[PDB]
């Protein structure tokens, strides 16, 4: 796979080539792949190769990455969340 | 409270919430 606007990657803290899970609200499908960078500002979310069987243009999806750390560090961990409006325009998150 | 342990947790690092797919490309 999935190519993602590099701005979006940065906002969610996801790295190029990092494993990602994708959960499709439109069709229910859930799959795992890795992140490819698309051009900053392109607002692209492109499913490539076999992943094209799991989403179509227009589908609404959640894209997540997961990390590991010790128990103690996990108790104050804060995930990055990026929110969107209209045509993949990033909006500010609340508390 | 959850007691402290020595184990490694898998935690949500971050997510894109309700982003919309723009392209689907089976062959590339």
Swiss-Prot record, chain A:
Transmembrane segments: none annotated. The active site is at residues 1, 34. It is an enzyme of class 4 (lyase). Binds 1 pyruvoyl group covalently per subunit. One of its GO terms (biological process) is alanine biosynthetic process. The keyword Lyase applies. Pathway: Cofactor biosynthesis; (R)-pantothenate biosynthesis; beta-alanine from L-aspartate: step 1/1. Keywords: Autocatalytic cleavage, Cytoplasm, Decarboxylase, Lyase, Pantothenate biosynthesis, Pyruvate, Schiff base, Zymogen. Heterooctamer of four alpha and four beta subunits. Interacts with PanZ. This is Aspartate 1-decarboxylase. It comes from Escherichia coli (strain K12). The lineage of its organism: Bacteria, Pseudomonadati, Pseudomonadota, Gammaproteobacteria, Enterobacterales. The gene is panD. The chain holds residues 25 to 119 of 126 of the full protein.
């Amino acid at each position: 796979x999935c190519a993602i606007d590099q701005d979006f990657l940065d906002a969610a803290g996801i790295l190029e080539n990092e494993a990602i899970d994708i959960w499709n609200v439109t069709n229910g499908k859930r799959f795992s792949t890795y992140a490819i960078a698309a051009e900053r500002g392109s607002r692209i979310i492109s499913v490539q190769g076999a992943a094209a069987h799991c989403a179509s243009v227009g589908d609404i999806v959640i894209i997540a990455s997961f990390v590991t750390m010790p128990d103690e560090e996990a108790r104050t961990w804060r995930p990055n969340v990026a929110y969107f409006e209209g045509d993949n325009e990033m909006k500010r998150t609340a508390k | 409270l959850v007691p402290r342990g020595s184990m490694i947790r898998t935690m949500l690092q971050g997510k894109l919430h309700r982003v919309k797919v723009t392209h689907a490309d089976l062959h590339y």
